[model samples]
Target: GSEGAATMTEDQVEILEYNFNKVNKHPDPTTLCLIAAEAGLTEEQTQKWFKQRLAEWRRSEGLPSECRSVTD
Candidate 1:
């Protein structure tokens, strides 16, 4: 069997990027709640998009995959 996939809408990405640039890259759940609500995306999609966008941001900065926080 095969599975289908979906892409984020342009407006959704715009909302996400706006928050990414203006708010915080690593948003806590509270900010994420607002972002997801504004973007009309489920919490899952909002979180996943931030993860993917973070990877893209890292690549643009030539950053290593290892994140700097003490948490595992």
Candidate 2:
């Protein structure tokens, strides 16, 4: 279960970025499944990473952190 602790390679990063852009970073279950498979990550890892990334993106764009995301 801890297999995803291994460092992410360039290929995984590319897929993550591609999915992030595709969904505005707030992917639902279907996209999460697709991305998790493509990235070789557990569902938990994929969900956590996307949540953190979306927070960062919102912060950088000066959006209110507490505001519900449009994707939500």
Candidate 3:
């Protein structure tokens, strides 16, 4: 075996997606800390997940697939 994988459980995925869709797509530092803890994920993981999800969301919403802060 090489190393551990980064895959998440189905429930974890569901919660993450729910936050992405229902809650704000971009989480502020405080929001991120809370969601990461709630979903049993690290803040870094939560941030990365948001970025990836935003790209996918943008594609479906007919937006440019560029990743940037929402304030920009």
Candidate 4:
């Protein structure tokens, strides 16, 4: 049920790019989700994608994964 790597539509790419640029500039998930919502994504989707993509970026950067919780 994965969307698949090759399945990126133009709109999806734009969304991902927008999310990436916003996060690259701000690097805060809460703020990034707000910015993405302002750019027209649902708050839930923005939050999910931010979490997903942040983990992807962290793995790519060879960084350690930290536990994320309410206290984090």
Best by TM-score: 3
Tell me how far the alpha carbon of residue 9 in candidate 3 is from the true structure, in angstroms, after superposition. 0.8
lDDT of 1 by residue, 1-72 (tens): 777687767899789999888998898888899988887877788888889888888778786555777785
Each prediction's TM-score versus the true structure:
0.74, 0.70, 0.77, 0.48
What would the per-residue lDDT of candidate 4 be over residues 1-72, giving only the tens digit for each residue?
897343335675576667575546335667766655665665555666667777667767686546888865
- Tens-digit lDDT track of model 2 for 1-70: 4763557788888888888877657777877888888879877888877887877788777864456776
Ranking by lDDT: 3, 1, 2, 4
List where candidate 1 sits over 4 angstroms from the true fold: 1-4, 64-72
Q: Whole-model lDDT for model 3 versus the true structure?
A: 0.85
Error of 1 at 39 (Å): 1.3
| Deviation from truth (RMSD, Å), model 1 | 5.7
lDDT of candidate model 4 versus the reference: 0.62
> Which portions of model 2 show Cα errors greater than 4 Å?
1-4, 65-72
- Pairs of residues at least 3 apart in sequence or in different chains that clash in candidate 1: none
- State which candidate, 1 or 3, has the greater lDDT: 3
> lDDT of each prediction vs. the true structure?
0.84, 0.78, 0.85, 0.62
Each candidate's root-mean-square deviation in Å?
A: 5.7, 6.9, 6.3, 7.9
> Candidate 3 lDDT, tens digit per residue, 1-72?
879678889878988888888889887989889888888998989999899888788878886535688687
Q: Per-residue lDDT for 8 in model 4?
A: 33
